Structures are given as C-alpha cells and as structure tokens.
Design a protein around this ligand. Sequence first.
Ligand code: HEM
Ligand code: HEM
Ligand code: HEM
Ligand code: HEM
Lengths: 146, 146, 141, 141
Amino acid sequence: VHLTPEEKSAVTALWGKVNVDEVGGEALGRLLVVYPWTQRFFESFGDLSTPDAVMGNPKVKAHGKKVLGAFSDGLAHLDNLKGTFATLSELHCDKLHVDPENFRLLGNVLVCVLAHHFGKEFTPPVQAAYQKVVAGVANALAHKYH
Amino acid sequence: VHLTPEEKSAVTALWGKVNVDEVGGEALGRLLVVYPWTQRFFESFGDLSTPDAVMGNPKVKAHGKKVLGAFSDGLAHLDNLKGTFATLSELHCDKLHVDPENFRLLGNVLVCVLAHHFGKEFTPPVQAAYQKVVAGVANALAHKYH
Amino acid sequence: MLSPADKTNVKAAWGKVGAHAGEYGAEALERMFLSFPTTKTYFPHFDLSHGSAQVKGHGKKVADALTNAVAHVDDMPNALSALSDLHAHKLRVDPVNFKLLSHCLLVTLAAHLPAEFTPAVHASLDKFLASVSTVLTSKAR
Amino acid sequence: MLSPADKTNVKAAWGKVGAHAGEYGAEALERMFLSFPTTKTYFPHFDLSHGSAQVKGHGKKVADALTNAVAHVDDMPNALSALSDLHAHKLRVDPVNFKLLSHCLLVTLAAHLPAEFTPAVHASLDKFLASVSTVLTSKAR
Ligand code: HEM
Ligand code: HEM
Ligand code: HEM
Ligand code: HEM
C-alpha cells in the first residue's frame, strides 16, 4: 500500500500485542454475526443459529485462527502482498468461490475488533494505518480472480 | 492499464469513431440528471432544473467537451494514466473539492452513452475493455487526493 | 421513491423491451460476467460460456421478474416477497453485486432502445433498478 | 428493518454513550478524515486540525441527531425528515460517504464501550447506522 515508515512501525508495534488465535476467532465470528450472508461458505461448520452459536463454535474459532495466521504472515511482507497472497487468491477464486467483497468486510470487522481490544491505544492515526493494511490484503487476495 | 493488446485495439478503434463534442456534452448532462447531487459543483452554470434544462445548457455542453477532451488525451497514455492525470488530480482535490466517487459515476455514465450511440458495435468484450479504462481513469484522478 | 413520472418512464421503456426481455436478461448477465468477473463466484455450477443455455435460461428468469416488478411498481415489496426471501436466506448474494447487475441492465437497454433511452428515462430506470435491489436485499439481516 | 432486539441493543449502548456522544461524534469525524481523506472534500470550509472547534462543534451536531434517532427509533423517517431534506437538497453528499462515517462511528463506539460492544450489539448498531444513512439519503433523487 502507501505505508509511511511511521505507519509501518505503528502497525508492527500494535500487532506485537495481539493474540492471533483469539483475535482470529473474534473477527471471523463477528463477520458471520454482523453479515449473516457470509455464513453461506460455512454450512459444514454446524450451528451458526445465534450469536453464541457462532462465537463459541469450535470450527469457527479454529478457522479464524487459520485466517489470521495467514494474515499475520502478510504483515511481514507488506512490500509484496500480491506475491505473498497469490496462491491463496487462486484458491479462494477457483476452489472456494468466495466473493472478494467478503475480504473487505472482514477487514472492517478486524478494525472494529482491534478498537474493541485496544481502546484508546487504537488512535485515529493508528487506525488510518490499519485501514491501508486491510485494504492492501483484501486487494492482494482478490488479485488472482478471473 | 491491464489492457491486453486485443483490449487495447478494441478501445482505440471505437474511440476513433467518437464525436467527442456530442459524447462529452451528453455524458456530463446525463451525470447531472441521473445523480443530481453532482450539480453541487455547477451552481454557476444556470438552470439545471430539468433534464431538458441540463441537456440544453451550453455551459454544460462546453464543460462536457473539455472533460472528454482530457479523457481522450489520456487514452494515448494507457500505460501511465497516473502520470498523465497527476496535475488534474491535485486540481480536483486542492481547488475543486470534487469527491472522487463522482469520477466513478461519470465513468459508468460514459459507458451507457457509448452503448447508446454504438448499439450493436458496443459488444460485451468491447464494454469489458472500456470498463477497465473508466476504472483506470477514475483511479488516476483520485490518486493525488490527501 | 419512484415518482409518478418515473413509474411512467419505466412502464414506457419496459413496454418496448417486450418479446426481447429474455434476450436482454441474457445479454446483461453476459456483460456482467465479463466486466465484473467477481460476480461469477455465485454461478460456479453454470456453464458461463457464450450463449450457454444456463445463462439464457437464467436471463429469462431475471427478465420475467423485472416484468413482474414493472406490473407491480406500486407494490414491489409485496410482488417480490418470495424473491426477497430466496435471495436473503438461500442465495445470500452480497448486496454490492446488485449495483453491478443494475448497471449492466442499463447498458443493455441503452444499446437496444436508442430512441427511448433519454436522460429522463435513464434516471428513472436507474432509480427503479435501485428500488428493486433494495427490495431484494431488505431481509438480508 | 430493526427488530425489537436491535432496538433494545441500540437504546442500551447509546444509553451508555450518554454525555459523551458529542466527544465520540467529534472523534468519529477525526477518524474518518484520517482514514478516508476523500471525505474532507465536503468540509473545505473547516479547520480540520486536531482539536479544531469546528470539528468539535460538528461532532456534537451529528451526535445530537443520532441521539434524536434513538429517541424516535419507531419513527425515524419522520424524526429525521428535516435532516434528510438538508442532506438531499443543500449538502448533496454522495451516498457512499454515509457508509464511511457509519464505519468510523462503529470504531469509536468499540473503542469506548468494551463491555457493551458485544457481537450482538455490534450487529444491531451496524443495522441502526445503515437505517439512519438510508433515511438521510432517501430524497437524494
Ligand atoms: C484476511 C483474509 C483471509 C485470509 C488470509 C484467509 C486465509 C485462508 C486460509 C489460509 C485458508 C485455508 C486454505 C486451505 O484450505 O488450503 C482459508 C480457507 C477458507 N477461507 Fe479464507 N481467508 C481470508 C478471508 C476469508 C473470508 C472473508 C471468507 C468468507 C467469508 C473466507 C472463506 C474461506 C473458506 C470457506 C475456506 C475453506 C474452509 C474449509 O476448510 O472448508 N476466507 N482461508
Ligand atoms: C473523466 C473524469 C474527468 C476529467 C478527465 C476531468 C477533467 C477536467 C478538466 C480538463 C478541467 C478543466 C479545468 C482547468 O484545467 O482549469 C476540469 C474542471 C472541472 N471539473 Fe473535472 N474532470 C473529470 C470529472 C469531473 C466530475 C465527475 C466532476 C463533477 C461531477 C468534475 C468537476 C469539475 C469542475 C467543477 C471543474 C471546474 C470547471 C470550471 O472551472 O467552471 N470533473 N475537469
Ligand atoms: C436485478 C436484481 C435481480 C433479480 C430481479 C434477480 C432475479 C432472480 C430470479 C428470478 C431468479 C430465479 C429464481 C428461481 O429459480 O425461481 C434468481 C436466482 C438467482 N440469482 Fe438473483 N436476481 C437479481 C440479482 C442477482 C445478483 C446480482 C446475483 C449475483 C451476482 C444473483 C444471483 C442469483 C443466483 C446465483 C441465482 C440462482 C441461479 C440458479 O442456480 O439457477 N441475483 N434471481
Ligand atoms: C449518518 C450520518 C450523519 C448525520 C447524523 C449527519 C448529521 C448532520 C447534522 C445534524 C448537520 C448539521 C445541520 C445544521 O446545521 O443544523 C450536518 C451537516 C453537514 N453534514 Fe451531515 N450527517 C451525517 C452524514 C454526513 C456525511 C457522511 C457527510 C460527508 C462525508 C456529511 C456532510 C455534512 C456537511 C458538509 C454538513 C454541513 C456542516 C457545516 O458546514 O457546518 N454528513 N450533518
């Protein structure tokens, strides 16, 4: 993206404090709860009938951890996201058939989760840096669609 | 942009048949009519009260020609829309305060006008190429916003 | 909110589509798949090749529903309740895609109804497809 | 549409905002200006500096309007008619910008209501801001 050095440091500093397992589960769960249409891809996950059903679903939690793991890796290759995410992009398109707009929704949910978790530490400018990051990842993930 | 030589020829060839004067006046007028909030930037033009009043407004027509002229000149630089529109990007930002979302609206209006004009000739594949160009131009124009 | 003039304009334009609605339904989809390749994510089970019978058939289906909405321009919510349900609870299409199809339908109409696709009619049809979109995405959550 | 549940959720979280609405309104604007710079094109007449009184003042107005929407959760179209008219005819804000402020309002709330910002409340708040945005943009054309 367009990350100033000080934006890159701000991202990295905060990311250091994140429990990826936990934030992953929280972001994926909230996605399925706020934009229920996104549940379309997880019919094998079981009970997604209520908020508690979603948030506590062991399958949602595990998938969340998988997704945020892949995301954390992306954070180390902020220079080459498209490269980093190319095989995942191809997979989401050709095998999973996941509309890329889902990637932007997840990005927004993650920002809300980071705000939820960090409170005041998630300053206006720290958010502006993350906004750029989630956009970049979403773009990277959509790059191989055809 | 990410135009294939084939998509390139398609654009280029259709364009050579365009009457910039008429297409520009119609694209701009249709914009003011379909999305009335765009009229906020043209208070000084006069009567925009009715479709008929917009479509007839000479100030509208002449602005349409100037806009399509610049657009037309950009098609000669498809490999660097960013550098071609850098100064215009800053102007739209810094002097005109035009929301870049308008660039997108105009692009779609332009595609509707070309289809209207070329009927049969404006095939799905020719449209796909134009869609890439309008998106590319809007992106370049919004590029220096801060 | 469609004005009396809008409903008029829509009824007029659609009146001319007539026996070609199905063909236009089909061409709009074709234009969509080509221009906005992400929309294909919802049709993995279809043959998306040019002139595919699946696309043709679906084009018809979309057209007929638009026809039914024109006939009930006054009672859209009610006329398309079943379709709103299907899309909301079964298909689960992301709302952004409705804007893409709408634009492709406009383009298609422009290309085929030269005389009728005036600035006023363009505005009304845009508003119309927007209202149809709203109805189809209203029970999404 | 907002369910009874949504309504309870919204009154509850907004309840908690209380006397901080103004400050949170201001903060949401600031976050929006920094993340989505294009939104600044509507405020060329403002000092957009950190702690600008204009932003502070503007933040209070926005918060008061939301507070008013919560107060009339069963009659928002009417409770907000005036503001809808203003946005439609004077301000002429492009619709997409509403989604941007809504998102930033959500971020702000999240950042200040750790205990109340549950998944369920997040979902209700999102739907609420979407409803308010719909009203403010209903007469746009
Ligand atoms: C930050 C964006 C995302 C990243 C980095 C990501 C990453 C991953 C990874 C690493 C996998 C496992 C790949 C494999 O099975 O070989 C996966 C699978 C999957 N992802 Fe994504 N994902 C993201 C967003 C999304 C979103 C937003 C959705 C849908 C709403 C989604 C839907 C799926 C599905 C359905 C699977 C397969 C699940 C299964 O095992 O059945 N992903 N993703
Ligand atoms: C394809 C996209 C566009 C291009 C290439 C373009 C280009 C231009 C050019 C070449 C000028 C001449 C002014 C100068 O050089 O001093 C101009 C002015 C202007 N444009 Fe854009 N424009 C585009 C889209 C838009 C849109 C969509 C709007 C608003 C809806 C807009 C609003 C204006 C205004 C208000 C002016 C100043 C006119 C005046 O001085 O009276 N432009 N534009
Ligand atoms: C103008 C808005 C739309 C209208 C009026 C419309 C109408 C319809 C109709 C009439 C059907 C057939 C229902 C049946 O089989 O009984 C249908 C199915 C379907 N629609 Fe929608 N549609 C619209 C927008 C969309 C969009 C934007 C998408 C995705 C990008 C979409 C995806 C689907 C899919 C995947 C099916 C099922 C196709 C099949 O499996 O045969 N629709 N739609
Ligand atoms: C749902 C969210 C919104 C609410 C509740 C809201 C509410 C208001 C209110 C109460 C006012 C003051 C009216 C008065 O002077 O009495 C106002 C003005 C204004 N709003 Fe909105 N608004 C919203 C969204 C937006 C957005 C998204 C934008 C642009 C990005 C915007 C741009 C403006 C502008 C430019 C003014 C005039 C400010 C001034 O010059 O003092 N509004 N809004």
